[PDB]
Amino acid sequence: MDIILGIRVQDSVILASSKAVTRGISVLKDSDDKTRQLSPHTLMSFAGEAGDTVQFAEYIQANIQLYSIREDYELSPQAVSSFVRQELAKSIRSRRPYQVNVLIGGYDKKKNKPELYQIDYLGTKVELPYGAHGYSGFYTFSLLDHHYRPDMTTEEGLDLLKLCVQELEKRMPMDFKGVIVKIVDKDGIRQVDDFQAQ
Amino acid sequence: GSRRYDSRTTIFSPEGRLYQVEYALESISHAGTAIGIMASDGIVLAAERKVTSTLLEQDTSTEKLYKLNDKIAVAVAGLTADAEILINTARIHAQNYLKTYNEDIPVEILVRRLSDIKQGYTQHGGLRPFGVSFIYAGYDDRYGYQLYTSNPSGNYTGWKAISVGANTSAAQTLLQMDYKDDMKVDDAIELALKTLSKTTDSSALTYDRLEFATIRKGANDGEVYQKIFKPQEIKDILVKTGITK
Amino acid sequence: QFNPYGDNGGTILGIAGEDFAVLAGDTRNITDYSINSRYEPKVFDCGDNIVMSANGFAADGDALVKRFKNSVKWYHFDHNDKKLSINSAARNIQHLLYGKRF
Amino acid sequence: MTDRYSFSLTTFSPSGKLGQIDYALTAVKQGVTSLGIKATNGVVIATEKKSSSPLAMSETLSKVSLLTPDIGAVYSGMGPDYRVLVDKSRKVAHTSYKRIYGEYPPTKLLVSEVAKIMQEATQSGGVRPFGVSLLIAGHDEFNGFSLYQVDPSGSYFPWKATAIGKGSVAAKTFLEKRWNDELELEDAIHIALLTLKESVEGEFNGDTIELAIIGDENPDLLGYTGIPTDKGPRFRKLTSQEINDRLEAL
Amino acid sequence: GYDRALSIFSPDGHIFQVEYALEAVKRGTCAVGVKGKNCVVLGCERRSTLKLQDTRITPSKVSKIDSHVVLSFSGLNADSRILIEKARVEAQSHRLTLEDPVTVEYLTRYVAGVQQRYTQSGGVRPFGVSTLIAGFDPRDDEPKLYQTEPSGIYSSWSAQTIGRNSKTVREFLEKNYDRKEPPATVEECVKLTVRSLLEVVQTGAKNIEITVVKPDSDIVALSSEEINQYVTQIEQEKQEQQ
Amino acid sequence: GTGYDLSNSVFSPDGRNFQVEYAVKAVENGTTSIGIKCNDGVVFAVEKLITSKLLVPQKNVKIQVVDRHIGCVYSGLIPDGRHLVNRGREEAASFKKLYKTPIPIPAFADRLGQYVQAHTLYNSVRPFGVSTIFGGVDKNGAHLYMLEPSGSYWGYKGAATGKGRQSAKAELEKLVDHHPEGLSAREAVKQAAKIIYLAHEDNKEKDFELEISWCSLSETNGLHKFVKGDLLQEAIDFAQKEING
Amino acid sequence: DRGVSTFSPEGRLFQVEYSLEAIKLGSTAIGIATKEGVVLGVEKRATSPLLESDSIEKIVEIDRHIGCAMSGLTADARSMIEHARTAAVTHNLYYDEDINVESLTQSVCDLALRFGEGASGEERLMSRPFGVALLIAGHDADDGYQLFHAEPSGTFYRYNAKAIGSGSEGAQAELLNEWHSSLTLKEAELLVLKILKQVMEEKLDENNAQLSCITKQDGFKIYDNEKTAELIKELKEKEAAES
Amino acid sequence: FRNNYDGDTVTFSPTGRLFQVEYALEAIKQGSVTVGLRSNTHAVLVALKRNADELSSYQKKIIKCDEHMGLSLAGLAPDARVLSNYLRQQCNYSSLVFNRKLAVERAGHLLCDKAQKNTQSYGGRPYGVGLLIIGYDKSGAHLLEFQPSGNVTELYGTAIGARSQGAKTYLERTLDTFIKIDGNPDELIKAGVEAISQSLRDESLTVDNLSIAIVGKDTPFTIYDGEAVAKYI
Amino acid sequence: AGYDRHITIFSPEGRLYQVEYAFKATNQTNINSLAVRGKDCTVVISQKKVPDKLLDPTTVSYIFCISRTIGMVVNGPIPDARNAALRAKAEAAEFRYKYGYDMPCDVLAKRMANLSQIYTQRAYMRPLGVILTFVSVDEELGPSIYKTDPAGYYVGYKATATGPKQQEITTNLENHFKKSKIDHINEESWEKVVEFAITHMIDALGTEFSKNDLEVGVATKDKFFTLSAENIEERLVAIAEQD
C-alpha cells in the first residue's frame, strides 16, 4: 500500500511515486522506484502489492520495444493503455488474479499533446490530468482539481504536488521516504531526483 | 510405397531454388491480370475475370480483388479457393490488433506474418503452400498510401505500379515510361485501361471482364472513404475516361 | 480424510564415532495405546558401509531406503562399482524428496 | 498412431494446374446431369437419377437434399461423395451463424465456408479430394434468391441459369437462348423439362428425375399455428405424380 | 504429423541440404561489410533493376537486434526474417534474465542454434540464407564480424562478404586492405567499400545501399550523392599512365 | 512393382494379396502341430525339433494356455506367435475384471480376428506370418478354432501345420467314421503321437521330442493338466509300436 | 532415397558407415594422455589469409578437470555442450564430486546417440548419428588420466593415444611406436606438433592450430598465442638438433 | 530388387520371414566371439572381446544386473546401453516389487515382442543384437539364448560368434560330463577356456581382452579381469 | 509414379484402380446368396459349401445378427467380412441409447457407407471391397434391403443376390414383379416363402443340397432367428411334395 501521485500539465506530464521498501515491520531501503524506462516520449509508473509489482521487469516493454526496433517508431500511450490493461484483465479469470495499480503517462508526438492514464487492478482505463491509487487519493483529489488550471506551467505544478505532500506528511501515518520527479515533454523524459532538497 | 513416391518437393531441389517456386509462377500466368497503381488521391486496383458468359451474374463482383480493412484493400492472383483461406485469416489477425492497440493496423505487419504461413508449409509439416500471389494496398498516417505485392516464395516487394498474371514484363514496361510522380484518380485509370487491352486475347476492353475497386481520400468528409464500384458504375467509367472499347 | 501422520513412534540415535559410526534404534512398534510388534528392526544397510535408518511413517522410508539401496547401485552401474562419496551420499536424497515435496 | 502420411497431393504439373483437379471433372462428365435457374419467382432445381439395376428403388436415393430450409443443393458426380458432405457441412453450418445469432448465413458466405473445407481436402496431407461438383441455390435476405456453381476447388460461381453433368456443353446453350428480366415459376419448370429430359435417353419416368422448387411456402410445413415471424421452408419438392403432371403440359 | 526426417544424409559426407543451401546465397544479392576501430560498415545491393519503391516504405536487408547491433543478411526475405525476430526475442531473453545486452558471439550461436536443430532434428528443413552478424558489446567500441553458414558454422573475419561472385570481390581487400592496420576515419571504410560494390551491381546508384553502424545508438545510411563523390576519385589516377 | 509385394493396403484380384500369400509358406516351414476335438475334451500337440545335443528337452513349450480353461499354440515364427499371446492374456484378466466370469471360446476368437484384420488395414502396420491354434473348455462344450495368418477362422474339428495338412487329414477323417462324436479322447492322445509320427518319415533328420498339453470336458471340467511320467512314454511307444523299424 | 531401416550386408546402418567421410573432412586432431597431464590439440589451418582465429573455438571445456575437442561439423559438437556439461553439473547436483571419465563417457554416449526414424517418447528426429569426432579426456580420482573418444557409431573405446582427421591413417600408424608409458608432458608437447606438421599442408603457425592441456590441479588451461608460439620455436630448435 | 523384401519393415519375404533378420543374424559374426554355458547351480560366461587397435581397449558388453544373474551379448551394441539397462531396471523392478528372481523365461518374453514391435509399427528400425542371459533360482541355472529373430529357448551351453561353430559342436559329447561335476567352479571355467582355443583359428589367447563371468548360489555375479584370469590363461 | 498399386490417386479413366479391383474381386470366394422381402417379413437364403468332415456347420455363417430386428448378408473374404460386422454391432447399440430408438435401415446403411467413403480420403488405410447387405423388418415402414457398395453408394433394393448368377435370378424375379407391380412378396406364410426363393435358386444352380449345405434365415416382425438343421431339412423335403 504505497503512495503514488502524478499530474499532467498543459504541455507535459509529471509523475511522483513514493520510494520505500517495506513489508510490515520495517523499512529496508529509502529509495525504491516502481516504474520502467520506455521510449523517451513514453513513461509508465507502477503501484500495488510490492510482490507482483517488482516481478514486472521487462514484459510489456519487451513487446513495445519489439515494435520500436522493427519500425523505429513510438506508438501513442493511448494504444499502449489498451494493451497493458488488456492483458491484466485476462488475468482475473485465470488461475492467479493479479492486483496492480498502474499509471500510464507519456507524450504523443502525433497530436502534440501529453497523455496520462489511471488504471487500477479492475482494468479501469481513464484519461485524467492527475492520478492516485488507494489511500493516496483521499488527501489529494480535494486539493488537485481545486487549484488546478489548464494554463498552469511546470513551475506552478511542482509546488502544487508538494502542497499535497504536506498533507501526506501529517494526515497519512505511512511515510513515503522521498519521491522521484520525472517530467515527459516534447523533448523527452527529464529525471529530477531533487525533492526534499529542491 | 509411402517413402518411394515421396519426392519431398519442400526441401532443397538441385535447381538452386525450390521445385514449388518456378512452377507456381506458371499458375500465376494463367491467373487474371491484376495491375495495382498508387496515385496521389488514392490507389487504383483493377483485375480481370475468368470466362465471362452471357448469363454470368455480377453482384458482389469481388473474385481476385477483396477489401480487408475499410482503409486497406487486398488483391490476389491465383486460384480463388486457395486465396479465400487467407482472406478472412488476415482479418482475424487484424481484429486481434484491434483488440490489442485499438487503432488502425499498418500493412507491413500482415505482410510478413502471412508470408510465413505458406513458407511454413515448406519449412515443416510436409505440406504444399499456395501458388497465389498477394497484392496489398493500404493507407498510413506516416508514409501515406501504401501498395505492396507478395509472391508465393515468401518475399515481398513494394511497388507503386505493379502487374501480375500474363504479360507481367510487358504490362510493367508500358507503365514504367508512362509513370508520373503526380497522378490523380482519372489519370491512373486511363493508363490502366490501355494496358489491360493488350494483356488478354479479347477484343479491346469490356466492363464485364473488368474487376475494378479503388480507394480515394474522403467522400463527404476529407478522410477514410473506400467503396467497391458496381459493374453498372464501371460502364460509366468508360464514358468519363473517353475510352469506349 | 488423508492423514500423512500416524507414526508408530520409536527413538533412534545417530552417533558419529572417531573411526566408526553407531546408528541404534528400538524395535518397538506401537499404534496409539496397543503395541503392534515388539521386535521390528528399522535399521537397514544400504551397502558400502552406509547404514540409514529412519524414524517416522513405515512405508515412507521403507519405499525409499530400500529404493535408495538400489539408487546407490545406479551410481555403480556406469561407474564400474566406484565408491560413492560418503559426504554427498545423502545429498541426492533431498532431490528424491523434492519429487514428493508436494 | 493413425494418419502417419503427412505428404500432400500431386505436386505442380507441367501444365501449370493440379492433376487431381482435371481428373475430378471426369466423374462430372460421366455423372448425372444437373441444372438450375433463378426466375426471381422461384428456383428450379432439377437433376436425373441413374438406376443401374431394375430392382433399385428411387425412393431411397435423393440427390437433392435440404441443408437448411431456405437453401437447396444438387450435385453431379459420384453418389456417396455428397452424403459425407451432408454429415459434415450441416454440423459445420450448425457451428456457423445459426448458433452465433439467429440463423444460418446466406448462401453466398455459407458455401464459401463449406467449400473452404473442400479445398482443405485438396491441401492437407493424407486426405484425398472428391470427384463431384455441387450446384447450391438458396434465398438470401437483401439479394433475394441465389445460385452458385461449386467446383471441387470450391470457387463460387454466381450464375443465373447454368447446367452441368453429362452433355453440359449442349444443355448450357439452350438456357442462354430463352432469357429475360423475370420469368414465371411455372415457365422455368417447363424449360428444365425440355432441356434435362431431352438431353438424355433411357429414363422417361419421373421417379428417376428429381425436381424441386424454392420460394413456395405451404402452411402445413411450419408445424405451428403461432405468429409467423418468418415465411417458412421455401424449399419444396414435387412428388412422383406431380412430376408427370408437368410432362403432360409439354 | 510428420515423424520422419527431411534431411538427406549423403554417403560422400557433404549433405545435399548443405550443398544447395549455399547456392541460395550464390543466387541472392551480395552483402559487403568491413570492420573498423570505433564502428563497422555494412553495404549491400539489390537485384531489381527498375526501382519504383522507396527505402523507407520497403525494408529489405535492414534489421536491428540491440541498440548498437544491426544485422544484415543475404537471401530470401522469408526464412531470414524468422531468425531475426527470434533473435530479438532472444536478445530480450538475455535482458529478461541477465539484465545485460548480449554480446555478438553468444548471439551468433542462437542464430546457428536454430539452424543446428535443422541439420540434426528431422521434420523441418534447413534454410538457404547466410547471415553476417555485426554488433557492439557493452562498453566496448571494437566491432565483430562473423560469417554464419546455414550449417551452423561461424568464424571471425575482418573484411568479409557473401553474395554473387563475392569471393572474387573479397580478394581485392586481401591485399590493399590490412587487418593489422585498420583505418581511423569512418569515411575511410566507405572508400574501400564503394570500390568493391562496383564489381557486381556496376552501374546505377539505386541498388547501392550503405549502412554504417555507429556507437551511441546511431545508424547512418549514405545517400546516392555521397556515394558518387568517391566514384570520381576512382578514375582520376587509374586512367593516368605514369 | 506389382504392388502386392510391398503395400497390403491395396486390393488383390483373387482376394488375397501376394504379401499375405508369403505368410502361408512360413506356416508350412515351421514345426508340425495338430489338435484334437472329441467328446471328452480338446487335446493339443507340440513338437520341438532337436538340432543339437545342447538343446534341453521338456523346456520350450509352444503351447500357451490362457488361465486353465483356454489353451493356445502357434507355429513357424516365434515372435509373431508370442505377440498374440500377450494380447489374449492381458484381455483375459480384463474380461474377468469387467464381467467377473471366465471367458468362453467363441468370445476369445473374436478378439483375435479383430486384432489381425486391423494390421492388414494399414500399410504402416505389419500383420503376422503365423497361424494361431487355440482351444479349451467353456460352459458349453468342446470347441476348436484355428486362426489362419490371413485372419480367417471358423469351426475346426482338427488343426494342422508344418508338414502338409493333406497328410494329416488322412488319420483325422478316419476317426470320424469310427467315432462319430470322438467318444474317448484319451486314446486320441496316443493317436496324436501317431499322426505326428506320420510326418516323421519324410522330415526325419535328427532326434525328435514330443510334448502334449490337453484339457478335458469330463476329467478336468475346466482345469488344466499335463502329460508326464507313465503317460509320457506310453503315447510315444504307441507311435513306434505299429512300425518298429 | 528411403528410410534408415535398410541395413548393410554386415548388419550396420548406412548413416553410421558413411559418417566416416565427415570425420576426415574436419580438422586433424591428435590427443595423447601421458603420465603428467593430457595433451590436447587441433588444427585450424586457414580458409583465407584474412581469417581470424581469435573468436573460433574448436576446443571446448566440459569441466575443469576434463577437456573436449571437435573435428567435424559444429552442429553435433555444441549439442553435447548442452548435454555433457549439463550431466557434469547434474552429477555435482546430486553426488557433488568429479564424475569418473570412464562413467561420464558412457553416460554421455547414452545421450550422445539418440536417433532413428521416429519415436513418441524419445526424439529420433536426428538423421546422421555423428558428423563430428569429439575428444574425451580427463583425470579420474581413482585410476588416473584417461583418453577416450566419441565415435560416429556412438560406441566408445579406451585409447592410449588417439588420432583423428584426414591424416589419421598415416598419423595413427606410426603413433604406436611414438606413445610410451614413460612419455612425459614436455616430451609430448613437441611430439604432437611434429606429427601435425606432416599432416598440415601449410606452414605451422599459431593461427593454424590450437593446443591445450588437462592438469589435475589447475585444470583445463588453453595455450595462449604467445605461449603457443613458444612451443613452435622449441620445435624448430629441436628438429635441427635431431641430426 | 532386394530391398523390396528387405528395406521395408512391413513386407513379407517369399519364405515368410524378414530379410532384416538375415542381416541381423550376420551381425553376430561381425562382433566379438562369446562363449557361455551352465552346469546345475553354477554357470560360466567366457567372452573374448577384441579391439580396433593395439593401443585400443574394448567396451564391456556384459552388464551386471544382480548377484544371482548375468548377461553376455555378442555382435554390436547400439541399443544395449539403453535396452539392456532397461532390462536391468526390470531386474530391480522385479526385486523391488515382485521380489521374484525374474527367471529368464519371463525376461525374454517381453524382449521377444519388443524387437517385433519395431517391425510391426512403422517409424523405427529393429535391434539385431544377440543376447545370452543366464539366471539362477530354486530350480538351478537357466540360460536364455536370445536371437534378433526373437528366439526364446534354454540350453546347457552355446557358442556364438565368428568361426565359433567348431567349439560349439566339439563340446556336445562332454556336455553330460560338465553338468554332473559340481563344487569346482574353477574346472567349469577352464572348460570354457578350451572352447576359446578351439574357436580361434587366427590368433592366440589374449590377457586383458578376455572377459570371464560366473554365477552361483553362494558366489555372486562378478567379472574376472586382469590378475583374476591369470590362473585361467 | 502414376500407378495405383501403392498410393491411391485419380486415374485417367475416371475410376480408381482400387475401385476396379474392389469390383473385380467379389465372388472370388465362389459362393452365392439371395435376399427377398415378404409382406410383413424378410426371407434371405445363402449357399453353403463344406467339402470336409472336420468343419463345424454351426460355425460358418454369412448371416450375422446385429440387432433383434436386423439381419445381414455378407459375401467376400472371411477375415474382412467380420470387420464390418463387429463395427456394425458396436454402432447398433450406440444409436439405440443415443437418439433413443433401435437401429433402422436408413442409418446403419448410411453410417457404414460414410465410414467406407472416408477410406477414399485416407490413402494410408485400406478400404473394404467386401459385399455388404443390410436387411431387417421395420415395424412402422416395413421390409427394406440396402446393399452397401465398396464405393459407399447405397440405394433401396427390392431384391438382391450375389455371385455371377445375380442377374440370372433377377430376370425371373423382374417378370413376376412386373405383372404384380409389387416390390416385395405379398404372400403370407413365410414357411412357403422360403421354398419360393429356393425355386429361383435351383434354376440358377441346378442341383440339390443337404440341411447343412444351405444357410437360410427368416427376419420376422420384432424378431430375427436362424433356422437350425431340423428346420432347414424340413423345408427341403416339403418342397418336393408340391412340385
From Swiss-Prot, chain A:
The modification Phosphoserine is found at S76. One of its GO terms (biological process) is proteasome-mediated ubiquitin-dependent protein catabolic process. It is found in: Cytoplasm; Nucleus. GO terms for cellular component: cytosol; endoplasmic reticulum membrane; nucleus; proteasome complex; proteasome core complex, beta-subunit complex. The modification N-acetylmethionine is found at M1. The keyword Calcium does not apply. SUPFAM superfamilies: N-terminal nucleophile aminohydrolases (Ntn hydrolases). Keywords: Acetylation, Cytoplasm, Nucleus, Phosphoprotein, Proteasome. The 26S proteasome consists of a 20S proteasome core and two 19S regulatory subunits. The 20S proteasome core is composed of 28 subunits that are arranged in four stacked rings, resulting in a barrel-shaped structure. The two end rings are each formed by seven alpha subunits, and the two central rings are each formed by seven beta subunits. The catalytic chamber with the active sites is on the inside of the barrel. Belongs to the peptidase T1B family. Present with 21800 molecules/cell in log phase SD medium. This is Proteasome subunit beta type-4.
Swiss-Prot record, chain D:
Keywords: Cytoplasm, Isopeptide bond, Nucleus, Proteasome, Ubl conjugation. The keyword Transport does not apply. SMART domains: Proteasome_A_N. Transmembrane segments: none annotated. One of its GO terms (cellular component) is proteasome storage granule. The keyword Chloroplast does not apply. InterPro entries: Ntn_hydrolases_N (IPR029055), Proteasome_alpha (IPR050115), Proteasome_alpha-type (IPR023332), Proteasome_asu_N (IPR000426), Proteasome_sua/b (IPR001353). It comes from the Eukaryota. There is a cross-link at K108 (Glycyl lysine isopeptide (Lys-Gly) (interchain with G-Cter in ubiquitin)). Its main location: cytoplasm. CDD domains: proteasome_alpha_type_2. GO terms for biological process: proteasomal ubiquitin-independent protein catabolic process; proteasome-mediated ubiquitin-dependent protein catabolic process. It is found in: Cytoplasm; Nucleus. The proteasome degrades poly-ubiquitinated proteins in the cytoplasm and in the nucleus. It is essential for the regulated turnover of proteins and for the removal of misfolded proteins. The proteasome is a multicatalytic proteinase complex that is characterized by its ability to cleave peptides with Arg, Phe, Tyr, Leu, and Glu adjacent to the leaving group at neutral or slightly basic pH. It has an ATP-dependent proteolytic activity. PANTHER family: PROTEASOME SUBUNIT ALPHA/BETA. Present with 7060 molecules/cell in log phase SD medium. Belongs to the peptidase T1A family. This is Proteasome subunit alpha type-2.
UniProtKB/Swiss-Prot annotation, chain G:
GO terms for cellular component: nucleus; proteasome complex; proteasome core complex, alpha-subunit complex; proteasome storage granule. One of its GO terms (biological process) is proteasomal ubiquitin-independent protein catabolic process. The modification Phosphothreonine is found at T47. Changing G41D: In DOA5-1; slight decrease in activity. The modification Phosphoserine is found at S48, S243. Present with 17100 molecules/cell in log phase SD medium. The proteasome degrades poly-ubiquitinated proteins in the cytoplasm and in the nucleus. It is essential for the regulated turnover of proteins and for the removal of misfolded proteins. The proteasome is a multicatalytic proteinase complex that is characterized by its ability to cleave peptides with Arg, Phe, Tyr, Leu, and Glu adjacent to the leaving group at neutral or slightly basic pH. It has an ATP-dependent proteolytic activity. The 26S proteasome consists of a 20S proteasome core and two 19S regulatory subunits. The 20S proteasome core is composed of 28 subunits that are arranged in four stacked rings, resulting in a barrel-shaped structure. The two end rings are each formed by seven alpha subunits, and the two central rings are each formed by seven beta subunits. The catalytic chamber with the active sites is on the inside of the barrel. Belongs to the peptidase T1A family. This is Proteasome subunit alpha type-5. The gene is PUP2.
Curated annotation (Swiss-Prot), chain I:
Belongs to the peptidase T1A family. InterPro entries: Ntn_hydrolases_N, Proteasome_alpha, Proteasome_alpha-type, Proteasome_asu_N, Proteasome_sua/b, Proteasome_subunit_alpha6. This is Proteasome subunit alpha type-1. There is a cross-link at K223 (Glycyl lysine isopeptide (Lys-Gly) (interchain with G-Cter in ubiquitin)). The keyword Acetylation applies. GO terms for biological process: proteasomal ubiquitin-independent protein catabolic process; proteasome-mediated ubiquitin-dependent protein catabolic process. The gene is SCL1. Keywords: Acetylation, Cytoplasm, Isopeptide bond, Nucleus, Phosphoprotein, Proteasome, Ubl conjugation. Gene3D superfamilies: Glutamine Phosphoribosylpyrophosphate, subunit 1, domain 1. The proteasome degrades poly-ubiquitinated proteins in the cytoplasm and in the nucleus. It is essential for the regulated turnover of proteins and for the removal of misfolded proteins. The proteasome is a multicatalytic proteinase complex that is characterized by its ability to cleave peptides with Arg, Phe, Tyr, Leu, and Glu adjacent to the leaving group at neutral or slightly basic pH. It has an ATP-dependent proteolytic activity. GO terms for cellular component: mitochondrion; nucleus; proteasome complex; proteasome core complex, alpha-subunit complex. Present with 15200 molecules/cell in log phase SD medium. PANTHER family: PROTEASOME SUBUNIT ALPHA/BETA. Pfam families: Proteasome (PF00227), Proteasome_A_N (PF10584). It comes from Saccharomyces cerevisiae (strain ATCC 204508 / S288c) (Baker's yeast). The modification Phosphoserine is found at S228. It is found in: Cytoplasm; Nucleus.
